[PDB]
UniProtKB/Swiss-Prot annotation, chain A:
GO terms for molecular function: actin filament binding; ATP binding; calmodulin binding; microfilament motor activity; signaling receptor binding; small GTPase binding. The chain holds residues 45 to 755 of 1063 of the full protein. The modification N6-acetyllysine is found at K435. The modification Phosphoserine is found at S357, S482. Keywords: Acetylation, Actin-binding, ATP-binding, Calmodulin-binding, Cell membrane, Cell projection, Cytoplasm, Cytoplasmic vesicle, Membrane, Methylation, Motor protein, Myosin, Nucleotide-binding, Nucleus, Phosphoprotein, Repeat. ATP binds at residues 44, 52, 95-104, 148-152. Coiled coil: none annotated. Isoform 2 contains a N-acetylmethionine at position 1. Binds directly to large unilamellar vesicles (LUVs) containing phosphatidylinositol 4,5-bisphosphate (PIP2) or inositol 1,4,5-trisphosphate (InsP3). The PIP2-binding site corresponds to the myosin tail domain (PH-like) present in its tail domain. Residues 675-696 form the IQ domain. Residues 549-571 are annotated as: Actin-binding. The keyword Hydrolase does not apply. This is Unconventional myosin-Ic. It is found in: Cytoplasm; Nucleus; Cytoplasm, Cell cortex; Cell projection, Stereocilium membrane.
Swiss-Prot record, chain B:
The gene is CALM1. It comes from Homo sapiens. Residues 7-42, 43-78, 80-115, 116-148 form the EF-hand domain. The N-terminal and C-terminal lobes of CALM bind to the C-terminus of KCNQ1 in a clamp-like conformation. Binding of CALM C-terminus to KCNQ1 is calcium-independent but is essential for assembly of the structure. Binding of CALM N-terminus to KCNQ1 is calcium-dependent and regulates electrophysiological activity of the channel. The C-lobe interacts with KCNN4 channels in a calcium-independent manner, whereas the N-lobe interacts with the S4-S5 linker of KCNN4 in a calcium-dependent manner playing a role as calcium sensor and gating the channel. This is Calmodulin-1. Calmodulin acts as part of a calcium signal transduction pathway by mediating the control of a large number of enzymes, ion channels, aquaporins and other proteins through calcium-binding. Calcium-binding is required for the activation of calmodulin. Among the enzymes to be stimulated by the calmodulin-calcium complex are a number of protein kinases, such as myosin light-chain kinases and calmodulin-dependent protein kinase type II (CaMK2), and phosphatases. GO terms for biological process: autophagosome membrane docking; calcineurin-mediated signaling; cellular response to interferon-beta; cellular response to type II interferon; detection of calcium ion; G protein-coupled receptor signaling pathway; G2/M transition of mitotic cell cycle; long-term synaptic potentiation. Changing E140G: In LQT14; decreased calcium affinity; loss of CACNA1C calcium-dependent-inactivation; no effect on intracellular RYR2-mediated calcium release. Homotetramer. Interacts with MYO1C, MYO5A and RRAD. Interacts with MYO10. Interacts with CEP97, CCP110, TTN/titin and SRY. Interacts with USP6; the interaction is calcium dependent. Interacts with CDK5RAP2. Interacts with SCN5A. Interacts with RYR1. Interacts with FCHO1. Interacts with MIP in a 1:2 stoichiometry; the interaction with the cytoplasmic domains from two MIP subunits promotes MIP water channel closure. Interacts with ORAI1; this may play a role in the regulation of ORAI1-mediated calcium transport. Interacts with IQCF1. Interacts with SYT7. (Microbial infection) Interacts with Rubella virus protease/methyltransferase p150. Ubiquitination results in a strongly decreased activity. Phosphorylation results in a decreased activity.
Amino acid sequence: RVGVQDFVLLENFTSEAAFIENLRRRFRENLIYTYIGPVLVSVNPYRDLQIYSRQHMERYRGVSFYEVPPHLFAVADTVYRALRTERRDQAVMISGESGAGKTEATKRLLQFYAETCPAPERGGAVRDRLLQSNPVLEAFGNAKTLRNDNSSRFGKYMDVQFDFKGAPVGGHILSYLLEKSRVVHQNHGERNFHIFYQLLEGGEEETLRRLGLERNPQSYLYLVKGQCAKVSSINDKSDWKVVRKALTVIDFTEDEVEDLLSIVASVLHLGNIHFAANENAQVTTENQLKYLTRLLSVEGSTLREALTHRKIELLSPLNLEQAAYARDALAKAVYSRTFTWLVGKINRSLASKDVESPSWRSTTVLGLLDIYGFEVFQHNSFEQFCINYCNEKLQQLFIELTLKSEQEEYEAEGIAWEPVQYFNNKIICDLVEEKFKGIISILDEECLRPGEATDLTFLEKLEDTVKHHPHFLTHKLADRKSLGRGEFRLLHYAGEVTYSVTGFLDKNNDLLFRNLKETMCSSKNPIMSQCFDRSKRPETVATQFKMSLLQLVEILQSKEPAYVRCIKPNDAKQPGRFDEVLIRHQVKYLGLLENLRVRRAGFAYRRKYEAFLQRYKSLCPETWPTWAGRPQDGVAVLVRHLGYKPEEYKMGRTKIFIRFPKTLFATEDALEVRRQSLATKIQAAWRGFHWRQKFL
Amino acid sequence: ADQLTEEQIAEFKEAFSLFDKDGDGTITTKELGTVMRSLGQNPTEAELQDMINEVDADGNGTIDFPEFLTMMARKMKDTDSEEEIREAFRVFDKDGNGYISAAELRHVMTNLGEKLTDEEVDEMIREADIDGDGQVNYEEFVQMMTAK
Ligand SMILES: [Mg+2]
């Protein structure tokens, strides 16, 4: 009952001050959801208020969105209804900073579909599998940062597949660039992945004994490099009970879980290996190396010299710096490749089991986008550069869809339109992924050959190739410090972030020595032999990532978008705290006001005459069964028979524009009833034809 | 548009007696639809009860030749063309590729107005899907069905 449920209805709609006030007023009354047109804005409550129960679902399912208050379930039912009436792939695009609520938002949507949508017949319950996949991925893919206690270190795009009856038949997940370094490293205050701590706290006596593991996290150098083994908002013993139960739901056999646990324990052991000296570097303690051979199922000797030696054509020893580096490289490779395997294993579970038809050409997908959000810390390295660049590329797609495209369309059409000014981050995207001239392209150029280019030589060619650019700064331009040396400042859509260039070349080339690679190929562990095989065309991490996002974008462009915008209340993860400076900044770069303008003056729906006519033509006698004239003319008589007021629609050059959604729904509800009559025509024609056959 | 012929009335007279049953020169209302389908007409069930409700007001559940012949001449005046049947199908075809899954056809026929029985649909799919691949070509099926 508070403020205005839709910003479009806001008076003084051009006031940035009025905008935030509505957000603040609704937030304290615990209304976290608000509409700008079809776009839903979400504010992180940072406390559990249950709007997500089955009672709440029932009130949003099968109802029009303008007739009910604003809620995440509305977008869910709207998107599902869009997927039913017209049979087109739909995708819910969710944006926000770290901790904004994207991940929790995606899980709630799934829940709605799982308990709401009809069940298949011989189909299975992929519903429980679709839901149980989260706990498993969070354990392996999430870790507490300073921004978020549960933080996704991987990007996720998930497709849910529906049959023609509207029930889920299965699904597919895509993952993006897990943050590798987190396994061997953490900045102070941050943990490693949840999985490690769940195992130690929740693992049973017999299981931890078999893995040669101690319950105390402080006893593993990889677990506590951040001094943080614990989180008050997280019960690791419970999460473990859930994960263990989820693995069975997604059809991990008890043997596969014991094998995965073997791999998890190996990385823990791997970090505990200490190297001492000769003249050069060798393993002092036999404890870790022991369990290591058993759980990894390799030969203890080949591993030891693999850690202590390098193949050059004989084997030269290594030192404490080099011996520790190779160790970390192995641990990163083992966990990362295991994560990839884990996703495929899940995908193998969500995949529908059928041969061909009927039909499976009639299945449509509902995409859900959950990525890692913009994040900025005191120290920012390659991992943040990838993540922040990811949000740039997706921030462009948002603009392309909600601002650029919609406005360029009016121009091409006959629609009267007064242009709304928006900031275009396309320039920032080019700074990164532009051919030849781009940061990623440069970093690749310096990655040719070893022992030649360094972190510092990279930044040098960076200064030289990118010259006086608005979104790029280094210590060689203007007044800085505050801008240091060996680092560059990049100004993103979400604000400036300082990056250290140290570790960039080593992290861009993801390099595992043949020495260690061979050792892993000899593993007798089932999961390990799948991740490592045999032994040219070594593409860089940054370029491969660039390929992934491009594919991800073109996947989203091919679908009918829905938009959810998540907003972070405060930096403290505190409930009831509304920080005006913070919310303002977000509203500004998200361009929410520029969006409110476009929605107020714009049209909710547009379709080409031919398409609009083929679909609704049965609703008018002059257009049924056929129309011989120009499609615009057919749409003209058709909409008159439908009773559209002149203010409810606009006839453009190639398309028809309908201002409000209520207009189209009432029309779609008419076509819904008309189908009843058309079916009767077929049934009557068959009943007639059939009798004449089996008789006469 | 189409008006009864002198020949046509003879055709309808001969076929009408087969169902004469008792021989009153009368037919049962519950038997009405069957004789129309036998004559080449494809009446909907709702259309059938409208005809029943007019001539059955005297009860007895019977209708004679003159008033039957009237129902036949009206039904012949508006009859769905092959093009209207194809376009009706096309609505339940989402691709626009001119195919529907037997599974989806069975689902609509049984779940949408004037629903067919499961036994009826079985028979429909049998000659509608000729190759038995689970896909039906409706433009081809419509021809066969409306074929004269
Ligand atoms: Mg089709």
